[PDB]
């Protein structure tokens, strides 16, 4: 039985994966993230405002991965042997400081790979249904904002 913030934290990886599956490689770079209670904000680098349809497909794909109850594997490799095992993709827009040389790369098979040290749930089913509440595109910096929240319907 995990907290709601650990839940929400894992959802970020799930939503990130769905964002990429719908929008493609152009949206694979995370700019930043934020978790507060059952609310989360994923900001990914992108160039346009997704149509309401893509947004729904993102949400549905996220929720679908939750139902699949896939395992969230947390490897803890070197840096390079993590580097050419997962590649560039495990990093965010702004890589981790060089004074770090032991990465905890969180992975969800064929979905998302990210260097993260926060606490995660063992499987995706423990996250629960995710709902996207607001999508904001910021032309200037070219950043896409995905606001979502975990739901409490018996979960």
Q: Does 47 bind its own copies (CB under 8 A)?
A: yes
Q: Which of residues 77-106 bind its own copies (CB under 8 A)?
A: 88, 93-94
120: annotated binding-site residue?
yes
**Looking at 7-15, 22-30, 114-122, 127-135, which segment touches its own copies (CB under 8 A)?**
22-30
- Contact with its own copies (CB under 8 A) among 51, 142, 152, 155: 142
Contact window for its own copies (CB under 8 A) among 7-15, 27-35, 48-56, 65-73: 27-35
- Contact region with its own copies (CB under 8 A), list: 3-11, 49-57, 127-135, 136-144: 136-144
The per-residue b/e assignment along 63-82, b for 16 or more CB within 10 angstroms, e otherwise, is bebbeeebebeeeebeeeeb
Q: How far is the CB of 3 from its own copies (least distance, A)?
A: 24
Residues 7, 9: Cα–Cα separation, whole Å: 5
Of these, 10, 11, 29, 111, which contacts its own copies (CB under 8 A)? Answer: 29
Annotated binding site for Zn(2+): 9, 13, 116, 120
Annotated binding site: 9, 13, 116, 120
């Amino acid at each position: 039985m995990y907290s709601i913030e650990v839940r929400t934290h894992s959802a970020l990886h799930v939503v990130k994966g769905a964002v990429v599956k719908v929008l493609g490689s152009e949206a694979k770079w995370t700019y930043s993230t934020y978790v507060k209670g059952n609310k989360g904000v994923l900001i990914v680098k992108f160039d346009r405002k997704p149509s309401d349809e893509e947004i729904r497909e993102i949400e549905r794909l996220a929720n679908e991965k939750v139902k699949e109850n896939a395992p969230i594997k947390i490897y803890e490799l070197p840096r390079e042997e993590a580097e050419k095992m997962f590649g560039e993709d495990m990093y965010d827009l702004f890589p981790v400081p060089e004074d770090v040389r032991i990465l905890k790369v969180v992975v969800i098979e064929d979905w998302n790979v990210n260097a993260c040290n926060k606490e995660h749930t063992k499987t995706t089913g423990e996250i629960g249904p995710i709902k996207i509440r607001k999508v904001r595109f910021r032309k200037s910096k070219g950043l896409l904002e995905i606001h979502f929240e975990l739901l409490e319907l018996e979960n």
